[PDB]
């Protein structure tokens with residue numbers, strides 16, 4: 001599923017991401033835009049053989065099991081395919097664990113490079129939240 005901007009913002013708010021660990025809703029929408037273009041089916045292979053999955057491009061090296069990343073961890077206790085569903089519950093819950101890990105949103109390369117220090121509130125402007 002490819003989410004609309006305000007549609008994703010609303011789902012993220014409903015799932016409790018707005019100000020989670022002090023990151024405003026705009027930060028999460030910005031990250032999702034640049035990680036996956038709001039597409040829940042997005043997948044990208046990393047150089048080390050792991051893969052990033054879903055709207056927030058959650059990585060199989062640490063967070064999920066894709067049956068092809070030998071020696072990796074499954075810290076969110078899910079198959080990586082659960083991250084590709086039209087329902088973002090699994091992605092959101094795993095993202096909450098990731099952002100709590102110690103590095104905050106710097107865990108997301110796209111966020112650090114394209115969202116951090118910018119006017120992220122512009123990503124939720126015009127939405128009925």
Ligand SMILES: O=N[O-]
Pocket residue numbers: 003004005006007008
């Ligand atoms: O969800 N339409 O911006």
Ligand SMILES: O=N[O-]
Pocket residue numbers: 060061064065066067068069070071072073
């Ligand atoms: O992601 N474990 O193959």
